[PDB]
Write a structure and sequence with these properties.
85 residues, Glutaredoxin_subgr, globular, 3 helices, deoxyribonucleotide synthesis, 36% helix, alpha+beta, disulfide bond, 4-stranded mixed beta sheet, Glutaredoxin, transport, disulfide oxidoreductase activity
Length: 85
Amino acid sequence: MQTVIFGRSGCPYCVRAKDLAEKLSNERDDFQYQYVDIRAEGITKEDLQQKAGKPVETVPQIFVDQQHIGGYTDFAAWVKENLDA
């Protein structure tokens, strides 16, 4: 599916979500990922806040096609109990 990482380049934080999503992207031939940045490209915390589900002031965040998962933690966990095959 389409996994999207919306993080803050510069910090070794999104790196985990990208690596995970990426690795998955290769472990499973049906998985693709996208690294989108909030400043580098120009996104607004408002729009994101809206599409994520009011994550107040917490980054980075991961999205899955249409649903929002949360932070790298939720992403790793989500992955574990979803792509365990």
